[PDB]
């Protein structure tokens, strides 16, 4: 392989220690000619098509937030900042399409690709936007999953979301800033063919591990753990509400059965199921809402012995007396028990599906990186004699998908009409 820049040594810079291809200077040309080449003629508008959309769908959206001046709040608060990040992530590719591949990352004066931190600022601009906003976006996602778990399993309330979020919002920004400035001091930034961007990892696999292979696994993992913990807490709450409802209905219906049946045998035969259900519901249970169950079971205790001792209508009246104590405690606690889970299920499912949808693209991104490192492993040493274009063009696309979800998650005609009437004036 000979069109992989065997430019003559100019002594410095880099012409003595790049070690590409096990030789002093045989390295990388600006486009990618040995895996697709002319297919880049398509790709020159491919990432263009999505990028403008991934601006527009979020361009209004944060502005929509600035219409409301924080209407939706703390359990939906990091949606705003996560949506905000993709604006700049798209804006970098907008800068790429307003300048072009042939001047922002192609070496102006030495005809290979850009390496390291450039003096005149050009590559560093789009690197700063893409890397900093990218990593910060994934951090906003994982603290959103933290908010989801704290609202689902702990249910600590919006003020308790606020008190932690006042620290955690400024805590989130630091980690991408840290990794960005360590990358910039290390100056492992470089161009990437069939992109025009300025990212990391084209120099070496160890840089790819040091920036993007590790954290993208890590943040994804610590988001998914919180997500599944919240979901299993939700299902536990759902099944315990269901069985408490079952106890309530087999209490009430069977009491009515007692009320309209006669004879001395089936009254005890039904009241024993009543006592069983009342004990089962008291075990689930708050102190007055368990004391009511206690005095209910004691009322059935008053009821049953007269049925044993050959009194039928005395048992009937003893059974009838329960209704008031059912009403004054058991009913009014079942109402709030049902209402809390209904208020959770009608809304936090609608929020957690954003997480469920989000988790897939991040994984496909780290899988695409894990295959591109093997592909570069295959091709790097392959020189002299001897003796998958779609996975490339997919990766930048699926980085940009989440932004247009913020163009569809914010779809609500009521608040759009609020925006229109607010802005009409």
């Amino acid at each position, epitope marked *: 392989r000979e069109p992989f820049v065997p430019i003559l040594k100019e002594s410095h810079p880099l012409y003595n220690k790049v070690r590409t291809g096990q030789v002093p200077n045989c390295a990388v040309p600006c486009y990618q000619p040995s895996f697709s080449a002319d297919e880049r003629t398509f790709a020159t508008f491919w990432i263009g098509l999505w990028s403008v959309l991934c601006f527009i769908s979020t361009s209004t959206t944060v502005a929509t937030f600035l219409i409301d001046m924080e209407r939706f709040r703390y359990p939906e608060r990091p949606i705003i900042f996560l949506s905000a990040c993709y604006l700049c992530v798209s804006l970098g590719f907008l800068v790429r399409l307003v300048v072009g591949h042939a001047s922002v990352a192609c070496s102006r004066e030495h005809n290979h690709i850009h390496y390291e931190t450039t003096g005149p600022a050009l590559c560093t601009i789009v690197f700063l936007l893409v890397y900093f906003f990218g990593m910060a976006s994934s951090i906003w996602w994982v603290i959103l999953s933290l908010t989801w778990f704290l609202a689902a399993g702990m249910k600590w309330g919006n003020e308790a979301i606020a008190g932690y979020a006042q620290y955690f919002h400024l805590a989130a920004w630091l980690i991408p800033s840290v990794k960005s400035i360590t990358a910039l001091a290390l100056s492992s930034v470089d161009g990437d063919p069939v992109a025009g961007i300025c990212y990391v990892g084209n120099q070496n696999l160890n840089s790819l591990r040091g920036f993007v292979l590790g954290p993208l696994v890590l943040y994804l993992l610590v988001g998914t753990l919180f997500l599944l913990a919240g979901f299993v807490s939700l299902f536990r709450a759902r099944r315990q509400l269901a069985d408490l409802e079952d106890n309530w209905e087999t209490l009430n219906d069977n009491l009515k059965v007692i009320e309209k049946a006669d004879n001395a045998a089936q009254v005890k035969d039904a009241l024993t199921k009543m006592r069983a259900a009342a004990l089962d519901a008291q075990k689930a249970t708050m102190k007055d809402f368990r004391h009511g169950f206690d005095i209910l079971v004691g009322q059935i205790d008053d009821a049953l012995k007269l049925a*044993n001792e050959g009194k039928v209508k005395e048992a009937q009246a003893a059974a009838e007396q329960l209704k008031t104590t059912r009403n004054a405690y058991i009913q009014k606690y079942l109402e709030r028990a049902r209402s809390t889970l209904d208020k959770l299920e009608k809304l936090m499912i609608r929020i957690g599906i954003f997480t469920l949808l989000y988790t897939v693209p991040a994984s496909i991104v780290v899988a695409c990186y894990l295959y591109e490192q093997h592909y570069r492993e295959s091709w790097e040493a392959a020189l002299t004699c001897a003796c998958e274009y779609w996975v490339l063009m997919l990766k930048y696309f699926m980085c940009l998908v989440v932004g247009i979800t913020s163009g569809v998650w914010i779809w609500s005609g009521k608040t759009v009409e609020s925006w229109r009437r607010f802005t009409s004036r």
Partner: antibody, heavy 124, light 109 residues
Framework: EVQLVESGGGLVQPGGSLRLSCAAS????????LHWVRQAPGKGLEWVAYISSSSGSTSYADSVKGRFTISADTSKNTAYLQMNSLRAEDTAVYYCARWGYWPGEPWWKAFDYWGQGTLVTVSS | DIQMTQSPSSLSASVGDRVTITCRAS??????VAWYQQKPGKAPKLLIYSASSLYSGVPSRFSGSRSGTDFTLTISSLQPEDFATYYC??????????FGQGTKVEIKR
């Protein structure tokens, strides 16, 4: 500690009658119910009768209805079971047991402080 | 009224083994069942009350559990003292107390 004792065992003719006395030392019996639990020889346990003299609530198992009767004065802190017309099955060992009222913990505990019980036989 | 069935009615087990004795209620009792040990000759002893809670004084190799209407005592380590009979006993009202058949544990030989 609380302690129980059974008395009145032995042998009777069939169709006889007998009184078993369960005396409870320590705890008083206004606050705790007494039960009687029967083990026929080479069998599992089975249930007979109870009493709980805070209200007087005497029940009987179906095998002993119309044959067994009970009393429990709390001034002597003891209980009395009278059996009449002994069918020859009723040869067994009898136990006196304790059980606490609703609510709270002593109802959730079942029978805990058992007396060691005595044997009666339908000697023919 | 309700029926209590106890299944592993005779168990041969070596010293230091793990045994499980189940129990099944005919109706749906709530968490209201107990496990008793009777050694031959003496009065029985409480061992487990309210399905899973331990009584005070007994060693902690014994355990109990409930799955719906199916209750289970497990001994993790078979002590060389614990060769006796274990009876399953529900309670619900006072006049409805019924006992299981009782299983005997035996020395493996």
């Amino acid at each position: 500690e609380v302690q129980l004792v059974e008395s009145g065992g032995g042998l009777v003719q069939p169709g006889g009658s007998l009184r078993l006395s369960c005396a409870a030392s320590g705890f008083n019996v206004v606050d705790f119910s007494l039960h009687w639990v029967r083990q026929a020889p080479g069998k599992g346990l089975e249930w007979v009768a109870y009493i709980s003299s805070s209200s007087g609530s005497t029940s009987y198992a179906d095998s002993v209805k119309g044959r067994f009767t009970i009393s429990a004065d709390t001034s002597k802190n003891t209980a009395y079971l009278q059996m009449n017309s002994l069918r020859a099955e009723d040869t067994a060992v009898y136990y006196c047991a304790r059980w606490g009222y609703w609510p709270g913990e002593p109802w959730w505990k079942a029978f805990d402080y058992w007396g060691q019980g005595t044997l009666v036989t339908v000697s023919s | 009224d309700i029926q209590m069935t106890q299944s592993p009615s005779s168990l041969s087990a070596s010293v230091g083994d793990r045994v499980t004795i189940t129990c099944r209620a005919s109706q749906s009792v709530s968490s209201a069942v107990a496990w008793y040990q009777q050694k031959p000759g003496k009065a029985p002893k409480l061992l487990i009350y309210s399905a899973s809670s331990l009584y005070s004084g007994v060693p902690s190799r014994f355990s109990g559990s409930r799955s719906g209407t199916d209750f289970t005592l497990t001994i993790s380590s078979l002590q060389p003292e614990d060769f006796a009979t274990y009876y399953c006993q529900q309670y619900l009202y006072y006049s409805l107390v019924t006992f299981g058949q009782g299983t005997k544990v035996e020395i493996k030989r």
